[PDB]
């Protein structure tokens, strides 16, 4: 959070465990 965001830091940076990329899952 002290970096930049915290509530928005997790957005596209901490996604689903099956997401090899951002959108790419398959």
UniProtKB/Swiss-Prot annotation:
Cell location: Cell membrane; Golgi apparatus
Highest taxon listed in the record's lineage: Eukaryota
Membrane-crossing residue ranges in chain numbering: none
Main function: Its primary physiological function is unclear. Has cytoprotective activity against internal or environmental stresses. May play a role in neuronal development and synaptic plasticity. May be required for neuronal myelin sheath maintenance. May play a role in iron uptake and iron homeostasis. Soluble oligomers are toxic to cultured neuroblastoma cells and induce apoptosis (in vitro). Association with GPC1 (via its heparan sulfate chains) targets PRNP to lipid rafts. Also provides Cu(2+) or Zn(2+) for the ascorbate-mediated GPC1 deaminase degradation of its heparan sulfate side chains.
Oligomer status and interactors: Monomer and homodimer. Has a tendency to aggregate into amyloid fibrils containing a cross-beta spine, formed by a steric zipper of superposed beta-strands. Soluble oligomers may represent an intermediate stage on the path to fibril formation. Copper binding may promote oligomerization. Interacts with GRB2, APP, ERI3/PRNPIP and SYN1. Mislocalized cytosolically exposed PrP interacts with MGRN1; this interaction alters MGRN1 subcellular location and causes lysosomal enlargement. Interacts with KIAA1191.
Stated family: Belongs to the prion family.
Miscellaneous note of the record: This protein is produced by a bicistronic gene which also produces the major prion protein/PRNP from an overlapping reading frame.
Disease (UniProt): Found in high quantity in the brain of humans and animals infected with degenerative neurological diseases such as kuru, Creutzfeldt-Jakob disease (CJD), Gerstmann-Straussler syndrome (GSS), scrapie, bovine spongiform encephalopathy (BSE), transmissible mink encephalopathy (TME), etc. Scrapie is a transmissible neurodegenerative disorder of sheep and goats. Most sheep that contract the disease naturally die between 24 and 50 months of age. The incubation period in sheep depends on the strain(s) of the infecting pathogen, sheep age at exposure, and the sheep genotype. Scrapie can be spread between flockmates, or it can be transmitted from an infected ewe to its lamb.
Entry text on domains: The normal, monomeric form has a mainly alpha-helical structure. The disease-associated, protease-resistant form forms amyloid fibrils containing a cross-beta spine, formed by a steric zipper of superposed beta-strands. Disease mutations may favor intermolecular contacts via short beta strands, and may thereby trigger oligomerization. Contains an N-terminal region composed of octamer repeats. At low copper concentrations, the sidechains of His residues from three or four repeats contribute to the binding of a single copper ion. Alternatively, a copper ion can be bound by interaction with the sidechain and backbone amide nitrogen of a single His residue. The observed copper binding stoichiometry suggests that two repeat regions cooperate to stabilize the binding of a single copper ion. At higher copper concentrations, each octamer can bind one copper ion by interactions with the His sidechain and Gly backbone atoms.
Record-given protein name: Major prion protein
Organism: Ovis aries (Sheep)
Lineage start: Eukaryota, Metazoa, Chordata, Craniata, Vertebrata
């Amino acid at each position: 959070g002290n970096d930049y965001e915290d509530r928005y830091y997790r957005e596209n940076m901490a996604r689903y465990p099956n997401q090899v990329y951002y959108r790419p899952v398959c």
